Amino acid sequence: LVSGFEATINKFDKNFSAHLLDLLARLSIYSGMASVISRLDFNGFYTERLERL
Amino acid sequence: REIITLQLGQCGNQIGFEFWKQLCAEHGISPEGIVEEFATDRKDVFFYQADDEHYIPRAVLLDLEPRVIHSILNSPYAKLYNPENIYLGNNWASGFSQGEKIHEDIFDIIDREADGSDSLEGFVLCHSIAGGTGSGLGSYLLERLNDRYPKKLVQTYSVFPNQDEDVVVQPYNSLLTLKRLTQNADCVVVLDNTALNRIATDRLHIQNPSFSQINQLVSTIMSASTTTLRYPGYMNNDLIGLIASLIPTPRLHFLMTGYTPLTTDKTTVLDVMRRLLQPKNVMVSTNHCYIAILNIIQGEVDPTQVHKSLQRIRERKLANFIPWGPASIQVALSRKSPYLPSAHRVSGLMMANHTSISSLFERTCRQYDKLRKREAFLEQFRKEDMFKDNFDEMDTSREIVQQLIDEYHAATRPDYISWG
Amino acid sequence: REIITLQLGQCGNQIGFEFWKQLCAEHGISPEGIVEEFATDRKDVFFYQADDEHYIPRAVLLDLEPRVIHSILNSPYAKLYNPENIYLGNNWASGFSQGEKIHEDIFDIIDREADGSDSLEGFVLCHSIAGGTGSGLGSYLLERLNDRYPKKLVQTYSVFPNQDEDVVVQPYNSLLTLKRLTQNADCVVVLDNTALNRIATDRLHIQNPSFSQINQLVSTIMSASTTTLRYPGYMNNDLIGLIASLIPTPRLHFLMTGYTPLTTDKTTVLDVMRRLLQPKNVMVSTNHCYIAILNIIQGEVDPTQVHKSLQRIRERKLANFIPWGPASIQVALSRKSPYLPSAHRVSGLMMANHTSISSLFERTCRQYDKLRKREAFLEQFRKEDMFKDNFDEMDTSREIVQQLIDEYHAATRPDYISWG
Amino acid sequence: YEALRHFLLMEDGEFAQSLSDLLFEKLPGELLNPLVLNSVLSKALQCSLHGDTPHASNLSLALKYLPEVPDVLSCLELRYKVDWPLNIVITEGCVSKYSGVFSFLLQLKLMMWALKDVCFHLKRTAMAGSVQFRQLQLFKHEMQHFVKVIQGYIANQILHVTWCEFRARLALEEIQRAHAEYLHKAVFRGLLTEKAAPVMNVIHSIFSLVLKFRSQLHPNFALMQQSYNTFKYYSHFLFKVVTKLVNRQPHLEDFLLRINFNNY
């Protein structure tokens, strides 16, 4: 639960973080208005960390 | 689904008595259980549809040196709940050993009510930490419940033992009970006795009947927390959904209590949100940061109000954040209950996972460390000696609570790929 | 932005009480704080939108030998403001030492209200110079405020200690307090007790209740000065903009008070401008020349009237000029307040930096020099001896006020590339 | 009308003290995405407590050029979209000129922001009583005073006189021409005309010296004293040029009085 678990989990985590960043980024260009992204990540981390324009 | 509520000890039977009386007044039932004509609801969460047209709650009645439980006996709310399972102190070791020798038939009592309901969601324990009567027996029964049924939830409504207090074995008892709470529970709801005492001596000018008024507070909080289960919503009509967001990991499962009116004896969502976020409308009184907050509101709520209120809460930043992730205050809306008094028409409560409770834990640990270093405050209790002649359980509990404090401080960090 | 008002001493709590009552009557609130139906405004400058639908002002209540503060307690305006921070004479040394030993929790009171508001613009101190109760504690708290927070503004509404007066240590107390005022304040608003006494004995025929009527005057002036902040204009919706033009340098920060009706118990801007410029509609009574004047008017003002009035003020030359630069009387227009009595519909007030206050300073310096040369009027106060056995603070304050007088006279010169 | 007076010409308070103040933290390498300037107006209207009205809805704050050049230049227009049955009265060619005069007023706030910067940078030193403290703040005060008297001039013309008119002309073809004259007086009394171009030309020179005075903050005192004296010579010339352009106004009679008052 620490070693093979970590190996299976981290590829899921990489894919989920990828699949989360591109959605919040592709919604952040569209401008509630920008409240949709703003509520989904209240922290503002993975909200758009790979800014576009 | 359905919740079976367990009450034990004099303080635990006191808070269960006031909670059952509160839900009796709340729902459309007499103290006998006679149906009313005004009752989107549910009456099958704490109540069995029982077999004399009284919605008899599934409650386990446990007594240990009964004084106030006798007063519970000759009462009009003894016609509401009595499935006739009453079966017989000032120490954790005494209550633990007494619970140990008779675990069989009280487990049969648990089995009877477990067979009683069709479905089950969790076990809510009316418990008092280092209350003497509740202590020891509560920790032992917690071990019995979590070992015997690994598929259900265990909830423990707990007080923090500071009542401006004589008992000097109380840090040892609270430390052993806290070891059981960290290891044998899925979630723990903790309150401070001193915080509720300060709030009660604030809102009124009462000094002597503090116990009964604190009972009113915890019963109102317990009704408010399960309103979303008792009244059908969209989420947290099961316990595990409300339990899920606040608890990020099996070690941090201790939840702060908030409720934005301290009053029941005009208003909007926006004002009660900003009124909730202060630590002096919290009923539990370096960098200290919440892991996750969840608030549930009940009233005549305009749906745009929660939206712009959460806007204001964001750009003001009046809540303490989580470094390692997003886990924030979540707006939940619930139905206003029938036959509740019409003050604070928009009323909300919050449950939150905060690292500030680590301070209270290490304070009690410091008290234990002081009395343990002095070695004059074990008092040589005979059950404490016979239970453990080497007293290594105190060392194990100290290690577990130290790991707990370290994991708290590690969750405080921006890295929680560093553990404890 | 938001102003947190501090009141201390019996005279300071008196003027704060009348000012809060004046703003309660002015804005649409009850003495409890109940909202009215008639209220371009703002109610967030002195008022917090507080949490029982009363716009409770952020006021620090300080008491030292309370007599009139007890009367403030049993009052209908004690339901307007009481955040419950009241915490406990005839000398500067006694009030200074008493403020010194308890600076911690009163600084926590300051910290509580500083955390209370979202934004902050300045600290307005209700203060009386050599008032005994206000004295010493006010100077010490001025040191605490300016040292602890260097990013905000400090304002001190001050009286000049001449009430046709027995206290002979009063020049020493006023000299030490004036040292603190010159060194530990960003701006000081000074009034003369004898000037307001003359105006009060003029407009009525009162001799005994002079204190309360003077309180009416200073409260009206304090409301009039912050009308442009409380009602949204275009400039001086922050304190520092009004503070900026009158103060050319950190040593000359003492402002004269003017207000063109002495009456509230037809009119144009042109007449009230020429009526304002005389030194006997000034409520503070060689070449003496203003550094900078600023006037604010409130009423039914035709916008051409201020234009040709300022034309007349130029070619008449009825104002005292500044040699080293341009810094002149500036016309500001503000909104007429709701629920103010309809006398003098066009009403203006002025704040001005004048070198004539150097005369009052050197008069009090001459009184101090007389009593200091005689060496019979220290009275051997024990707190004065224990605070400074050598009494070198009196010499340092004398040096600072002498440098102040020299800088005043140097600003009077056409060269202010010659300093003091 | 009384809404655009509050926002597009700024009569709402701690709105001008909030919108420009939040924008000017970026100035440029920032204020390029329309995702922070598109959101800051919605945060300013909450911070004024006269906002969130449905007439402060459809307020679009957008640029027409991307600046790749603080900076006193501005290319930002605050707009409003008029609905259908009032579009026959107010057209959306008038609102563009409201944005046009807005741009100069916003550039004016940029001066009292950079002067606020250098007044705040010196404020943390004081307590302090050095020669270098008092005699440096002496330079600052005259420079801020210049802006506050020319701001008082704008704060007379575009807000007090021209608001008293076009309320004496609303007390259907006439309404369009009434509005078109209300607009026409604002650029004429504002001295943004090509007629008053030489009196406007010196204001930019003063503004460049203010930005350089903010740039410095000590051994370089003499540089700042030199800049202050060059500023004072330029003001001494402006006082005569404004007087010469009265031979060429009623509204200009304020400005020579505003800029110097009893000094030749």
Molecular structure report:
Chain A: Belongs to the TUBGCP family. Chain A: It comes from Homo sapiens. Chain A: This is Gamma-tubulin complex component 2. Chain A is mostly helical and 53 residues long. Chain A has helices spanning 4-28, 35-40. The longest helix of chain A is centred in the N-terminal third of the chain and has 25 residues, at 4-28. A nine-stranded mixed β-sheet of chain B has the order 2-1-3-4-5-6-9-7-8, with helices on both faces. Chain B contains 15 helices and nine strands. In chain B, strand 1, helix 1 and strand 2 form a beta-alpha-beta unit. With 420 residues, chain B is α/β, with parallel strands linked by helices. With 264 residues, chain D is mainly α. Chain D is 59% helix and 4% strand. Chain D has a two-stranded antiparallel sheet with strand order 1-2. Chains in contact: A-B, A-D, B-C, C-D. At the C-D interface, helix 10, helix 12 and strand 8 of C face helix 6 and helix 10 of D.
Brief overview:
This is part of a larger assembly, with 1 copy of chain A (53 residues), 2 copies of chain B (420 residues) and 1 copy of chain D (264 residues). Chain B has 420 residues and is α/β, with parallel strands linked by helices.
For the biggest sheet of chain B, the summary is: 9 strands, mixed
Most extensive chain contact? C-D, 49 and 47 residues
Oligomeric composition of the shown chains: part of a larger assembly
H/E series of chain A:
HH
Overall SS class of chain A? mainly alpha
Rg measurement of chain B, Å: 21 Å
- Helix share bin of chain A: 55-70%
The fraction of residues in strands of chain A falls at under 5%
Q: Kindly state the number of beta strands of chain A.
A: 0
Order of helices and strands of chain B: EHEHHHEHEHEHHHHEHEHEEHHH
List the strand order in the largest sheet of chain B: 2-1-3-4-5-6-9-7-8
- Secondary structure tally, helices of chain A: 2
Assign an overall shape of chain B: globular
Number of strands of chain B: 9
Overall shape of chain A: it is elongated
Look at the helices and sheets of chain B and give the structural class.
Answer: alpha/beta
Distance between the terminal alpha carbons of chain A, to the nearest Å?
42 Å
How far do the termini of chain B sit from each other?
35 Å
Q: Kindly estimate the percentage of residues of chain B that lie in beta strands according to DSSP.
A: 5-15%
PDB class: cytosolic protein
Keywords: Assembly, Intermediate, Complex, cytosolic protein
Entry title: Structure of recombinant human gamma-Tubulin Ring Complex without actin
Chain A: Gamma-tubulin complex component 2
